[PDB]
Structures are given as structure tokens and as C-alpha cells.
Amino acid sequence: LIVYDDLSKQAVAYRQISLLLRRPPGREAYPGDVFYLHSRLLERASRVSEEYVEKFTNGAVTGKTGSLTALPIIETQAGDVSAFVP
Amino acid sequence: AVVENNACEQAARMIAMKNATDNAGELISDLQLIYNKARQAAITQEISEIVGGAAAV
Amino acid sequence: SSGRIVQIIGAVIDVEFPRDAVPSIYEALKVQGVETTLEVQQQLGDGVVRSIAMGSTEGLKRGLNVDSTGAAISVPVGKATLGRIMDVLGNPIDEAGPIGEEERWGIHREAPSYADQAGGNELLETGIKVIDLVCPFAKGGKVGLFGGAGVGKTVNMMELIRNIAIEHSGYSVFAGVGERTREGNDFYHEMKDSNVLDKVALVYGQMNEPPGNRLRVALTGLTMAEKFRDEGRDVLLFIDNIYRYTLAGTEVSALLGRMPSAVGYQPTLAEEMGVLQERITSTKKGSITSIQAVYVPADDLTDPSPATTFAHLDATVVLSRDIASLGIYPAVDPLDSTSRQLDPLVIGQDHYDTARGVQYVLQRYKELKDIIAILGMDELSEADKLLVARARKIQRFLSQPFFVAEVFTGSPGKYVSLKDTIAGFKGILNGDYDHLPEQAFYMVGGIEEAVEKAKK
Amino acid sequence: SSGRIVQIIGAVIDVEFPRDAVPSIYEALKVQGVETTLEVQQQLGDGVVRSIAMGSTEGLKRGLNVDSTGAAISVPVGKATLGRIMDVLGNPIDEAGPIGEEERWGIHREAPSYADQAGGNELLETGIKVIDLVCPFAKGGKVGLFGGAGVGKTVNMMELIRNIAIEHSGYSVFAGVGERTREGNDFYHEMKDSNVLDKVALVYGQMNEPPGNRLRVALTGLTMAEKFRDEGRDVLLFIDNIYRYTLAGTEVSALLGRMPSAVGYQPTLAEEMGVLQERITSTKKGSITSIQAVYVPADDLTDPSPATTFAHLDATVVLSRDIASLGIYPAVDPLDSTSRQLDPLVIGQDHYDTARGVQYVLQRYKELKDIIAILGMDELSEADKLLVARARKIQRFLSQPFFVAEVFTGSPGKYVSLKDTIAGFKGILNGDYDHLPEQAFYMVGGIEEAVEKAKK
Amino acid sequence: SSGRIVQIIGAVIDVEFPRDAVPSIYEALKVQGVETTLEVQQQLGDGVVRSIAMGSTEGLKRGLNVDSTGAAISVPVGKATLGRIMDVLGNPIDEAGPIGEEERWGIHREAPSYADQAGGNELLETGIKVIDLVCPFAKGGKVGLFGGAGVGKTVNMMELIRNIAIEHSGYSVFAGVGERTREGNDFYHEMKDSNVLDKVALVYGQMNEPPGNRLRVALTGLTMAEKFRDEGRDVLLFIDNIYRYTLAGTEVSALLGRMPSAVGYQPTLAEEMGVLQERITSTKKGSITSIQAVYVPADDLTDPSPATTFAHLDATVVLSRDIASLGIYPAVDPLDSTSRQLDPLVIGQDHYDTARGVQYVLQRYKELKDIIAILGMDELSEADKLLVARARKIQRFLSQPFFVAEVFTGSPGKYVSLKDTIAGFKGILNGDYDHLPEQAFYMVGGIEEAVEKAKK
Numbered sequence A: 001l002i003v004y005d006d007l008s009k010q011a012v013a014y015r016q017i018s019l020l021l022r023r024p025p026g027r028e029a030y031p032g033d034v035f036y037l038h039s040r041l042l043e044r045a046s047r048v049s050e051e052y053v054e055k056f057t058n059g060a061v062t063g064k065t066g067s068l069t070a071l072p073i074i075e076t077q078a079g080d081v082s083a084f085v086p
Numbered sequence B: 001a002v003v004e005n006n007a008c009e010q011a012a013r014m015i016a017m018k019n020a021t022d023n024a025g026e027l028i029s030d031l032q033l034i035y036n037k038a039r040q041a042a043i044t045q046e047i048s049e050i051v052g053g054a055a056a057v
Numbered sequence C, D, E: 001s002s003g004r005i006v007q008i009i010g011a012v013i014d015v016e017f018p019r020d021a022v023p024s025i026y027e028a029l030k031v032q033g034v035e036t037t038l039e040v041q042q043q044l045g046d047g048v049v050r051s052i053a054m055g056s057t058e059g060l061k062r063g064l065n066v067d068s069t070g071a072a073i074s075v076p077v078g079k080a081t082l083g084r085i086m087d088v089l090g091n092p093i094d095e096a097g098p099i100g101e102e103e104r105w106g107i108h109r110e111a112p113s114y115a116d117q118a119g120g121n122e123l124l125e126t127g128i129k130v131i132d133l134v135c136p137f138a139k140g141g142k143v144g145l146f147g148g149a150g151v152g153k154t155v156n157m158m159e160l161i162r163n164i165a166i167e168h169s170g171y172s173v174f175a176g177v178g179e180r181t182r183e184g185n186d187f188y189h190e191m192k193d194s195n196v197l198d199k200v201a202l203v204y205g206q207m208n209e210p211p212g213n214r215l216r217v218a219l220t221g222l223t224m225a226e227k228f229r230d231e232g233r234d235v236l237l238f239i240d241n242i243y244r245y246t247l248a249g250t251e252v253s254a255l256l257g258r259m260p261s262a263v264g265y266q267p268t269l270a271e272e273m274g275v276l277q278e279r280i281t282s283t284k285k286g287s288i289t290s291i292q293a294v295y296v297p298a299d300d301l302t303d304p305s306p307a308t309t310f311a312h313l314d315a316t317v318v319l320s321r322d323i324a325s326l327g328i329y330p331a332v333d334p335l336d337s338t339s340r341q342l343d344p345l346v347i348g349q350d351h352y353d354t355a356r357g358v359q360y361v362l363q364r365y366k367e368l369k370d371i372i373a374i375l376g377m378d379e380l381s382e383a384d385k386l387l388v389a390r391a392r393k394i395q396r397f398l399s400q401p402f403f404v405a406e407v408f409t410g411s412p413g414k415y416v417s418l419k420d421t422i423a424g425f426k427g428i429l430n431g432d433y434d435h436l437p438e439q440a441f442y443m444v445g446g447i448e449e450a451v452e453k454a455k456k
């Protein structure tokens, strides 16, 4: 089980690096790959098959599925769910 | 009966105009939040166009 | 001959080749020590070309040797693709071995000519009340499901894949462009257990993937659909999210040296959309019926990507968050949604007048919202009170329990014919149901079930 | 070695040094023959550094010699700074001679580590009833102060400055971030007249100073507070306005040419706030508690400046023009003011229930007052009339005579413990003082003083 | 000596000359072979000058030789210009052959000095009710007709030309800047058919012409007016759209290498406007009475261009889209419009009280309009109900059919006098017409006709 305390603070940190590297901003001044910042992270939380575990461990672990559960956290302003990062 | 109904009418009208005053306050509060969003977005878009035009010149 | 990596910036790579051996635009290249594939986007001069990697660039370095393949990315096509899962480069990703391909086609092609176009108007019944009433679909036409995050697009599409496969007997092609890997796994096993898999070709490039994959997966799936259309067949082409093709283009645009346009979009936004969208069409040889989901950024329908997509479709279904918040599903907006088939010469006067009557009532109810919010319904005229009561019933009768939504609530799914749809709304407009309670119309399929629900 | 000025563009100066003598980032440089200090911001390469002048650049020219100092801007610290006015560089702006300093510290350092944090959420006893009851301050915490002019902001700061020094053996530091020269002179005389000047160090960055001065004054005042904390003390750091610290950062970021962020703020907005706010904490040696005045742009609490600041605040004290009109001082609004420490797991169930009990009575009384102003006092129930009587007693018991306010109140000042505060309000909530008149609770201090005032 | 074209980008052209022979700022250049002229905007250094072409660039090539003329664009001035149509370079654009010129003046000049300024306040009657009431004009002053698209700027200018230019015994200049070529043809045939053409110099630069032409036509028309003023004459100067001079500068600004300012305008917006507007003035030698039409982008009076224009004018007439959208013409707003002449010490107390009286009634009605739309007319006071009726009648009595608008209105044109205007509005304010219906005041010249329309 993994908890990300503020995924909205990770987006603010990545926006700072992108603006200092002069990458052209988009909506709410966030970089063009801000969706991919969160999507490539959260796609790793998942349940894998017995065949995946058997292949990864070279046969050492047989008959078990593996999993990673995620609880990301997002702060909103004035309860607005329609903003770009949320 | 007619005079007591008129007293009841003014009392009902007081509650109706109190409710109308309170209902209008909720609409004003929601529009102010939408206005602040538009205020922040206009400043961000103008700055993006000025930085974009000065990178080209 | 061969070249050498000279620069690497994220997903974009510059390679230098001898002046007499410079590769062509869209030509595929392979890195010698890792076998990573690159697609040429532009020629910079002095033998240097700029390319996008069709995989991860982590571990690559300057000076590595690169081989030009002499052709664009080529994928397997035909009967051998049915019941198989493939990636952007046409490799199998289902662990079922190599594809028994007879031929391969390059993923880049020109759209069919003006003289090759088809004039089809044959009505397609979906079994969904709101769609069949105000958004009638047609065989060989294009449909777009517009909506923000969590409004109903993947559910409302999977219900269309289930309902359209009842009358359709040909092949289907599915292209997963930048969406959840779990939903691709759920859909594959559902069709495998249901024995539907041997008539569907599956292509994937989900959110976990680098920008080059997400940018070209749409072309790979469309190339397989064009093979079946050109064989003289009637095929279905489903695109999981067409907005991701445009977004993958935005992530790479600044790296390609292009000046940004409005709200940070690539300057080529409308051309990148037209080059793909014009290939997705029916011709004099065969037909392609296509359904595409269109994401709406931050619920803004005026955003450049959604705004540029409307002109490429025959039917537009607009989902709303305000409607979904009331409990109504499918969350379609009758006043924003429309179709080219909503014409008296195509659907007949009875359907056309019922649909126009529903829109008139819902439009008038929308005008009274602010007055009703401050002063309540009791201040309205006797005519407006009757219209608002019918508007509330129409709005609830548009709801429908789906056979794919059963897991969410428990209720059984309903299929409603076009005849039953017209009869129900015509009766509510005429006033034949003015006595039944407003909650009797919510989640009931056909109009007769509203009469039975009112008995409780 | 020494460098040469190579370019001057407003407050931004570029200096060239020999390749083996290039100064470090944040290092302070001195122009030869002129009283001008330059702080290094960036290393451009080729032996050239970009810097910001800590004063006017008028009369400077290219080719002037510049000397490296080997360290960041270094300021005097300790006992000698008390009762003195200083600029951003630590120079004595008052005409009182040199500061009797024994040590100097650089203004830039890392916040205390994960292992240096003190422990449990210990409270700071201000001795002010309304604050210690409804707005409890934690040691090492940050307090946001809200309200207009003429509502007692200065008097509230002077009372806190007196109480921390006399009742807790601590000291105070005041950082005038973008200080108005007229108000800076008035505050210095008011503190001298109120006999609190020898308990506080004054650091001023006036509005007419360049952006670099207004940005660094908060770090100069914080460096003096860090020396007092290291002596084993609990310290108060007052920041004249935290919005002006944010704006000075926006101005400097624009001068350095960085690409602007959302709503036009600097891209480093959250990091610049974090670097300042993370040094204000409770450690194993001592603590720094901060009271910061907050300005809200366009009354929009969602604006990046207020939103970034509210993530660091632990309490909010709101000053009301309406409460000041009734003659009550301090003018804190017990309903709008809040604290993260007002939790039964932090302050205990007895203090929490007493504070929530007071807020419940005052909130219900605000509603009853609107009924009295419309329908009349005769429409209220007997229980409501009793609640109005208790609410008026609670409302007057929140008032207190301050030692710095004896000139206005004509009464001797009072310090009230948290134990006496809880006991007094608990008694009024339970009805133990229902027989006393409302005038007995006004300007008395502890509950025993109200009982004695009622006999006069 | 001669130079060579080195670069061409749109309307901007760079020309290289010998270093000992660089042409001056604003100097005119001629291309060899091709019939095109260039104006030096800047001297770039190394013998290169940046220029704007005064014709289309489609035929131009790099390497064409260019001749320096040694002076700025010089146009014919004096009596020979009357009854003629000319372009920006002063060439005749009518089939009447060469101009009988005796002197030529350069289009670039310094504004008259502070010691040369005039001081007259002689009131000018226009025959239009709203203008004569709230916007009184004066001889030798500056008038601006502010408004968006389709609200009446050209129509009001044509009515003002009819009521002033024809009757006047001095010379006139009409400058069509960025105008529709159809309006220029209609006006030429109108001046010719009315026998007025012998008193007017016509200069035309329409929307089909290059940016260099639209950037300088205003200076050509003004140079002809300055020759007449400096001879001791009283002159009329009409400019159909001065916004088009600013826009031509915005279109070329970025190609001239200038960074953009707010709302995408050129950084030189206020100086380019001041350099032109300060020459359009009356002096101790002679007088210029001027009427300019000012376009308002998207109807927003806060846009930088309209906002910078108000300070240059004596009389500001504001046209409202909301009034035009109600069929009321002329669509003038009495609350936003104003004039320096609306002073009791300049006109009289009776006129001033009538104007302020009308404004007071219309200002109070603006808050009641929103009340009536939600709660109805019956909830207003007996004084408010009466005032609202007078405000709606005043709003209609501002309307008047013009002689130049008969093609749009169908009814004949009405000229109304100052005394007639004052008497009509005082009658409605005092209640002398409370019994007449609201529709009787719509489109009826003086007050008598309103009494007659009520009977039809």
C-alpha cells in the first residue's frame, strides 16, 4: 500500500523545473506533460498475475499474485473539482 | 376573518422576502468564486502571450 | 548507410547521416545496441534529422550507431490480426506467439479522394433512448462522445459496443490511445470468456507509455481498419480516446522547435487532427462506422482540442457533469448534443417532431432556472407550471439502466426500441401522463414500466 | 581576488572575475570606493556572475573594481541588537552609533533537520484571554493576522512583545518588509513611549529600497531570532506583511528574466515561502513563534499568494471594526478567528469544550440579535432571553486592560493565565455568575476581579 | 547615393546603403524599376536601414537597387488640393490629371509649442438633440465619436458634415483611414452632387491597402490642414477612423523588432498617439475644428487604444450597442458622454440644469431596470413608478431621424435647434407630457411632433 501525501505539490515542483528550463506553459501555467507526470506514476499501482511473478522471480515464487495499492491525495481550492490537476 | 388573513399575509410576505434575500446571497457567493477563477485565468493567459511574443522578437 | 546520435532531449533524438544517405520523413530507424525504433519527423540540414523514439530513451547516449530501414513503420494487416493484441509497432503483446501475417502496410497514408466518398443515410438503432431520439446514428458514419473526467464516456461506449454487435456480423478494430491498462485487460478477458474475441483486432498504447507510442497507436489501429474496408467489408472502428493523439503531439511540439499557439497547443493542431480524421471514412469499396471518445479538458468545451473536433463528426453526443450530479445516466445533454440524421427526409416527421418538442420544453425550462432558484415554482404562470412539470418528467424519462452498469448499482439493464422511445416522449408531450408522479420515470426503460412503477 | 563591473541594467549588475576566484551563489560583493553591496544570484560562465545591488545604482560605471567577501550577507546578532533600528545589511539606520556586536551570522542557512524537531504540540501562553481561549498559539507556530487599519494591530503587537519578555524571559524581532517610512518612525516612538523598545530588535526594508532589499529583510530578522533561539529562549518574530515578501520575490524574478508562472507570480513561489517558513519551528534548544500580517489580493482567497501562505499558518486572528465600535479591546472576532491547536487531542477535552461552548453561545446570540432587530425582543422565548444575558457577559469578559494601553484605558494592565481563562468562561457558561450585571465583566482580567467589581 | 534591398518580410523591407551615405529616419527611398517607395523607420547600423513599404511587396526581389531621396515623404499642399482625391504619397487617385501644386511639405513635423496654443470657447450648434444637450461642441476644438462595430460612427459623422461643413465658409479636409471603399465612393459622389467638393480636400487610404499606407494617411491629411491653418484660415478636419493608425502600427511593430505590451499593442502606443494628436490643434495663427471617429474593440471602453484616446479630446460622444439593439437612433449614451463646454459659465444655468436633470433621471432608472425584471413594476413606490415612465419617455425622445439615414429608417430627416431641444426635455422632466403614450416620443424631431404622433 502506497500513500502520496500531496500529488498537487509534486505538480507545483515539476512546474517550477519546467518554467526554469523555459518549456512553454499551458493551462494554469502547468507544463504540456503534466498529465503524463501523474499517469506514468499511478499506472504502476496494480495487481499482477501469477505468470508475471513466476517470470520475474525466475521460478522462485510459484502460485502467487503481487499487488501495489495507491491512495493519492489532491487538495482543491474552494471545493472546485473542475480544475486542471484534479 | 378578512382582517386576520391580511395579518397572516404580511407575516407570510416577511418570510418570503427573507428567503429571497438569503437565496440571492448563495447565488452571489457562487458567482464570486467563478469570477475569481476568470480573473486569475485572464492574468495567466496575458502573461503567456507577452512571454511568447518576446521570445520571438 | 548508418548515422550517429548527436543530441537527446526527452523523447526527441537528433541523428546525423552521410549527405548522400539522409533518411526520408516518417522513415523508421533502429538504434544498433538496444534495437529501439525512431520515426523521422523533419530534416534539419547538414545530414541531420530529428526523430521521436517509439520507446523509452533512458540509457541512450550520444555517438551510438543508427540504422535506416528504408520504409515507414509497417504493421501486419488482414485476418491474422483478429483475436490478437498488438503494440504501436505491430508486435504481439498477448503472449500467444507470432502473428501469421500475409502482408504488412505502412502506417502513413493519404485520405480517400473526393470521388471515392459514400452518401449513406441508413439509420442505426442503439437501443438507448436519448441517443436514438436526439442523436440518431447512421451506418458508415462517425460518432463522438464528448465529456470531462468521470462523466460516462467509457461506460456509454462499452454499452454501444454491446448493443451494436447484436445486428453487425463483420469485423471490429479497437485502438487504445493513452488510457487505463486495467480497462484493456478487463475488455480482453470479457470478450475471451464471451467467445466474441475472434472477430475483433486489439491495439494498445496506454497512459504508462512514452509520447511516441501514444502519438502513433491511432494510425496503427486505423491501418488495420482500412485493410478490412478496402477488402469490401463493413467494419467498426473504436478509438478509446482521440484527444490523447493530439496531447502526445503537444508534449513533443516544443522539442520539435515549433513556436506554441493559444493555451500552449502545437501550431499544427488542426492539420494533425485532419490528417487522421479524414482517413476514418466510408468509401465506394466498403464502410467504416466509427465511435470515438473525446476528452474535454477541465470541462471546457471551448478548449482548442474539443472545439476543433466537432467539425469531423456526423453525430455529437455531449455529456454533462451537472446532469450526472442529479443522478441521471446516461448523462447526455439534449440541448448540446446533435446529429446530421435529425432531418424530416431521413427519420420521418413523427420522430422529428417528437425530438423538436422535447428540445423546446427543455430549453424553456432552462430559461426559468434563475427565477425558480430565487422565488420558487409557485410564482410562475399556469402555462409555465405545466411546462416545468413535463420538463421534469422528460428529463427523468431520458435516464436508462445499462447492461454494463449493473455492477455499480444492481438493477438489470434495459434495451428500448426506437418505436417505444418515440411513443413514450410523444405521450408525455401530449399530456397522457400528467397524473403519474415525477419519480416513476427515473430508471425504467420503456414507457409502460413508468405506469407499473407509479403503482408503488 | 577582485572583479570588474562589465554590465549595469537597472538594479542588475554583471561582474567579471578571474577563473580561479569566481564568487559563490549568495556571496556578498563590495564595490571599491562606493558604499554599494551586490548579492550574487547566478554564475553565467566565462568568469561572469549576475548580481543584484542592495541600494541605488546611480553614478556607477563599467570597469569599477569589486571585491569578494568570502561569505553571504552577514549581520550582527545577540543582545546588542535590542532597542536598535537596522537595514537589510545590519547597518544602524538610527543615529545612535555602531552596534556593540560580539558576533556576526550569514543570513542564508538550511531549516532545522527532521531529527532537530522538538516533540509534542506545546502551547505558548500569551496572557490574553480571547487569544488563549479561541486562538491558541503553539510554540514554534505561525499566526496570520487579518484586518484593516485603526483596529488595534500595533497595540496587540506591543502587548505580545511585553508579555514574552517579562512573563517568559524571551525576546522579539520585528521585520518591516516594505515598511512605510512615516509608519516606521511612528512605531519606533510608540514603542519608546510604551517602554517596550529595549525588548525588541527592529529590522526595516523601506518601500523606496530596491527589490533585493525587500526580499532579504525577512532573512535578516530571522537570523537575529535564530541567535536568540540558540541561547535557549522562546522568541517572537513579527513580519509586517508576508504579501510584500512574495511581491519582492516576483519583482526580483522578473529582473533576472525568469519565465513567469500562474497569475504572473515567480516560478519559485512555493520554494521561496518554504525557505522562510521552515526555519520558524520549535527545536530541542528553543523556539521561534511568528505573527505575520496577511494581505489578500482582490479579496480572492484562492489567489496563489494567500493560497501558498495558508499552507504554513497554524492560527488565524481576525480583527473586527464592528467589535472595536462597541468599546471592546482587543477587537478579535471569536467566530471568524481559528486555530489548528483548537482540538481535544492537542489542548485536552476541558479547554476544547469551554472554547466550543463560548462559540456556540456567541453564534446563537448573533442569530437572536437579527430577530430582535426585525420582530422585537418580545418574540424570543424565556430560554433565548437567558442566553442573550449570558452571551453579553461572555462578550464583555473577552475584554482585557493591557499594560501598553494604560494611557487609553486609565486602568492598570493585566496578565491572565490559561487556567484562570478556562475557569472564568466555564463558570459563565454553567451560570455561576448569572446574578452579576454585564458591566462587572468589562475590563477586569480574571473572574475574581469581576466578583469584586460588582460590589463597587 | 543608392542602396540595395537585402531582405523582405511581409510589408517590412531592409535596404543597405554605403556607410558614408545612410538615409535619415523617416527618409523616403525609391526602388529601381518597380513602382514602390519605402520609409525608413530605423537605422539598424552597418549601413542598413529598416523600412516599411508604401505599396505591395509581391514584385520585389533582393538585390534591387534603391535611391535615397534625401527627405521624408513630401505631399502637395494649398489651394490645388481642393476638389481632389489623393493617396498617401499625394498622387491623384481620380482621373482628373496632375495636381496644380506650387509647394510640397514633408508629412513629419513637430507639434505647435506651449506658447502657440489657442483658448476659444465659442459654442457650435449641431442640430442633433442628444449632442447639443449633453455634448456641446466648440469652434477650434476636438471631438471624438467613440463606439464599437455597427452603432453609427460614420452615420453621425455624415450628419455632422452636413450640418457644419456645407454651411461653413472655410476649407475642409476629409481623411478616410482604413475605411470601406464603398463609403468613400458614396461620399465622393455625395460631395460632387451637392456642389460642396470645391471646398474639400479628399485623402483616401482604405482597408485593401498595405500597412505602410494606413500608418501614414492620417499624417498626409493633417499636413494639408496645417498648411491652411498656418495661412490664418479656419479649417474643418474629419477622420473616419483614427483606430486604424494604431492598428497599422500593431501589425508592423513585431516585424520592426519591438516587444509587445498589454493586450498585444505596440510599446509605443501612447507616444505614437501623442505625436499625431498634438498636431491636430487650433493655434494663435489659425484654427482647426476636428471630428474623429474612434473604434472600440469588442465594445470595451477599457481597451488600451480607446482608453489612451479620451485625454486628447474636448468633447467625447459615446455610442452604446445596448441602445442600438432596441431600435433607438442615434444610439448615444447620455451618462458616459461628456464635453469641456458643459459649464454654466460657458453656456448657461438653464441648459446645464436640463442636462443634469436628464442624467439624474436616467441614472436612477438604471438601478430600477433590474428590479422590475424580477419583482415587477407594482412593487415600486408612487414616485418610482412615475420616474420610470418619464425615464422610458426621455430615452425615446433622445431619438431623431437623420437626413443621411432615410435609406435605413424610411421616414424623412429632422434638424432640431438648441432651444427646441432644451424646451422638449424640460417639458418631460416637469410632467407636461405624462399623459402621452411612450411610443409617441420614438423618432420625432422636436416636441410638437410627439404631441401629433400620439393622435395616430
Ligand SMILES: Nc1ncnc2c1ncn2[C@@H]1O[C@H](COP(=O)(O)OP(=O)(O)O)[C@@H](O)[C@H]1O
Pocket: C147, C148, C149, C150, C151, C152, C153, C154, C155, C156, C241, C293, C295, C329, C405, C408
Ligand atoms: N451510473 C454510474 N454511476 C457512477 N459512475 C458512472 C456511472 N455511469 C458511468 N460512470 C462513470 O463513467 C466513467 C467512464 O469514463 P469517463 O471517466 O467518463 O471517461 P474518461 O475516463 O475516459 O475520461 C467512469 O469513470 C465512471 O465513474
Ligand SMILES: Nc1ncnc2c1ncn2[C@@H]1O[C@H](COP(=O)(O)OP(=O)(O)O)[C@@H](O)[C@H]1O
Pocket: D148, D149, D150, D151, D152, D153, D154, D155, D156, D329, D330, D402, D405, D408, D409
Ligand atoms: N487595548 C486597547 N485599549 C484601548 N484602546 C485601544 C486598544 N487597542 C487599540 N485602541 C485604540 O485604537 C487606536 C488604534 O490602534 P492601533 O494599535 O494604533 O491600530 P493601528 O496600528 O492599525 O493604527 C489606539 O490609538 C487606541 O485609541
Ligand SMILES: Nc1ncnc2c1ncn2[C@@H]1O[C@H](COP(=O)(O)OP(=O)(O)O)[C@@H](O)[C@H]1O
Pocket: E147, E148, E149, E150, E151, E152, E153, E154, E155, E156, E329, E330, E331, E402, E405, E408, E409
Ligand atoms: N441613426 C441611425 N438611424 C438608422 N439606422 C442607423 C443609424 N445609425 C446607424 N444605423 C444603422 O447602422 C448602419 C450604419 O451605421 P454606421 O455609421 O455604419 O455604424 P458604425 O460606423 O458604428 O459601424 C446601417 O445598417 C444603419 O441601418
Ligand SMILES: [Mg+2]
Pocket: C153, C154
Ligand atoms: Mg474513461
Ligand SMILES: [Mg+2]
Pocket: E153, E154, E155
Ligand atoms: Mg462605419
